[PDB]
């Protein structure tokens with residue numbers, strides 16, 4: 001089997017798909033049960049009617065994934081269903097190859113569980129797991145559309161790359177030199193989608209009734225109507241009376257998901273009996289906790305403090321080279337005006353002789369990471385980088401995760 | 412304060428141009444002024460500029476095509492130090508003329 | 510206008526320390542025993558860092574049922590004992606075999622497995638790894654990870670030198686008004702407008 | 718709205734390229750010889766070679782002499798300096814009428830200059846004397862100058878200043894963490910305010926909080942500022958004013 005399977009393991013959503021297809025198959029990674037006791041599958045969460053009382057139980061914790069039974073059952077559902085996903089099917093998978101993605105700071109024992117489950121259970125011939133930051137130097141192997149933003153302005157892989165990957169779990173800043181991550185300068189940002197979602201449930205619980213019981217509705221509002229301040233919090237706060245968005249709640253008898261209504265847009269003249277929630281301050285208050293954590297009362301340092309500390313641990317020759325090549329991946333970078341704000345606030349702290357450039361791809365960045373992650377398999381270095389099955393059967397189970405797939409060898 | 416608006420954009424200082432010399436007999440003599448204004452040189456900053464113009468031109472003529480270009484200075488270990496050297500000595504080239 | 514002559518005492522007056530001051534009113538006295546004993550036995554303070562971590566992890570959690578189980582894990586991550594920092598700081602299962610049979614009924618509609626097993630030691634390890642039912646705290650309590658591994662994974666990734674680079678912004682706690690920066694009386698909470706105070710006196714004022 | 722006081726209906730002489738004046742053009746009716754001859758005077762000022770030429774306009778009231786004077790003043794344009802003056806205004810008791818007359822002859826001429834100036838700005842970090850810690854005998858090291866470390870956004874640089882501009886720095890009551898504006902060639906000092914990093918130090922403060930200035934520390938630009946030669950004569954005559962005693 002020549003084309004392998006590209007599976008990106010995440011906390012919110014696991015993106016799987018073959019190497020031939022251009023776009024991955026989106027499937028969630030959770031197990032939701034209702035208050036009545038009915039348990040639904042992860043892809044069937046969007047099909048149910050009532051989103052009021054939903055208990056979310058997922059095998060992925062904040063650090064890593066601990067339970068491989070529910071995650072392995074999700075893998076059996078996504079890989080073993082030909083009728084659920086159009087065109088995709090797999091009979092056994094003994095000759096197929098797998099490209100997986102794990103965390104950079106994962107535990108070694110859970111990685112032994114991963115290599116034993118994937119290697120022994122699924123009978124893969126060769127597998128190469130690596131974090132998402134290592135696939136980022138392989139962007140230049142193929143020609144693609146990627147927007148470049150200059151902060152100062154008003155083989156095929158490259159050595160110097162700076163990877164800032166925001167996620168649902170947390171945000172990681174991983175510097176990459178010679179295609180290898182430098183783990184002494186990696187910084188962790190604890191701000192993620194759970195803090196924006198829970199913070200929006202707290203602010204909406206103070207301005208209105210407590211929406212903490214419903215997480216999918218606040219997740220949809222946070223995905224739809226949220227935007228980052230382009231200039232500052234003060235200029236966006238003086239324009240909070242002109243810029244406002246009105247969200248109508250989805251009534252369970254009529255509509256499963258709500259709709260965002262703009263007061264400038266007269267395209268929705270249909271009246272309804274439901275009430276509308278006004279959103280003025282929470283539009284720009286929620287994404288401002290990355291740069292300024294004083295608004296959310298947390299003692300976190302901030303994103304650019306971890307960027308400057310991440311550049312502080314690097315050698316002085318590699319400091320002005322990594323700031324010229326910055327690629328941003330993840331779902332939190334899909335918010336508008338976040339790249340120019342991050343490049344501007346990063347430009348206001350860097351020295352004059354160094355010029356900062358931030359390259360953010362068009363569209364969703366997680367699908368971009370799956371696309372370049374699929375373009376890594378087409379590279380000829382993957383044939384030398386892959387580990388055979390008989391080599392794993394010869395060596396111990398701890399050697400393959402400790403030496404080649406481990407961060408401790410690169411330290 | 413309404414007439415302390417931005418004047419220094421459209422104002423000359425007129426004290427730097429040696430035109431308030433009606434106050435120059437307070438602390439300057441005649442032979443101090445002739446002996447002080449006989450002695451103002453060009454051709455020494457021209458010497459320090461010309462001794463650095465050789466080091467500017469040997470890097471500009473050889474590596475000046477891809478040195479200052481942002482495409483080659485994006486990811487390079489040897490070219491970026493030559494770029495910062497050239498942009499470092501251009502400021503020292505114009506500064507001595509200033 | 511300004512008086513050029515000012516009468517002043519020698520002992521009472523100091524030029525530096527200047528002080529001016531003026532149904533039933535009664536000063537607020539806390540009847541709590543741990544508050545009085547806590548007062549008599551005593552850049553951000555460490556207890557406020559613990560409050561920010563506890564509020565950050567309570568705001569990090571998704572479900573109501575997972576709220577009391579989180580400060581045990583946060584107390585495992587910090588290193589301080591659980592019962593002391595849980596008693597001093599006030600804040601603000603997953604797997605079942607029958608449920609796994611319900612997921613087997615969920616994906617039972619379309620599947621293509623091939624079952625083939627042989628008794629080996631790696632298959633006993635497969636049955637141990639596949640059926641785990643262990644929390645992340647149980648993995649942190651295990652001796653399989655090194656102490657330097659836990660220090661590098663948890664304590665070394667956070668930034669040490671740079672605490673604050675960007676300018677700090679204080680806003681109102683109700684609507685975030687920066688045009689009126691006015692900290693309250695009993696709590697010292699920043700309140701901008703009049704409706705923010707009238708909504709502040711009822712719910713968000715604990716020290717009143 | 719629009720104020721009209723016996724003028725503003727004339728937008729110049731309104732002559733053709735051949736020279737022949739129209740009957741109805743540019744707020745003028747009739748008067749061909751004074752308008753076309755006045756345009757010959759307009760080209761005579763556009764020659765930039767002639768001097769000493771005196772052309773009087775003689776006529777009765779309501780005939781258009783001052784209107785022709787606004788016609789040549791509007792036909793010349795804003796780039797050519799125009800000095801309106803009345804002969805009754807030349808009488809002075811401070812100086813003679815000779816000095817006001819020849820002074821007005823120095824007021825008519827203009828001279829445009831171009832010059833570059835250096836712009837420094839940033840947040841004040843340290844105000845401290847220099848050491849260079851060998852004593853050399855010459856000093857228990859200082860004569861009181863101050864190194865001003867201006868922290869800008871895109872750069873951090875330290876600069877040494879004169880005691881006069883340091884005296885104006887003491888006049889502006891700045892401290893550690895205040896955004897200032899300092900000009901190199903002139904020496905003038907303007908304070909913008911306290912930086913935004915110290916806004917959370919006190920809840921209420923009379924000093925406004927301004928953001929950090931974007932860009933480098935050292936900036937340069939060129940101006941095409943015009944300044945009359947009489948303004949250079951007053952600049953050569955008497956001291957105007959400074960920030961020192």
Ligand SMILES: Nc1ncnc2c1ncn2[C@@H]1O[C@H](COP(=O)(O)OP(=O)(O)O)[C@@H](O)[C@H]1O
Nearest residue numbers: 010011012013167168169193223331332334366
């Ligand atoms: N268009 C969007 N607007 C705002 N937020 C988005 C958008 N798309 C995705 N997100 C956020 O990104 C998160 C998904 O990130 P994901 O790529 O799943 O991270 P991980 O790699 O940790 O699984 C979601 O929680 C969602 O809140």
Ligand SMILES: Nc1ncnc2c1ncn2[C@@H]1O[C@H](COP(=O)(O)OP(=O)(O)O)[C@@H](O)[C@H]1O
Nearest residue numbers: 723744745746748777778779780781782783784
């Ligand atoms: N040819 C003309 N076209 C238009 N307006 C004229 C003309 N001649 C005279 N006037 C008008 O007559 C008014 C008075 O003439 P003025 O030039 O003041 O006379 P004098 O120069 O003798 O004082 C002016 O406001 C002007 O508008």
Ligand code: BEF
Nearest residue numbers: 011167168169170
């Ligand atoms: F694990 Be995800 F990338 F936050």
Ligand SMILES: [Mg+2]
Nearest residue numbers: 009010132167
């Ligand atoms: Mg990810």
Ligand SMILES: [Zn+2]
Nearest residue numbers: 681683684705
């Ligand atoms: Zn408010």
Ligand SMILES: [Zn+2]
Nearest residue numbers: 693695696714
């Ligand atoms: Zn209060």
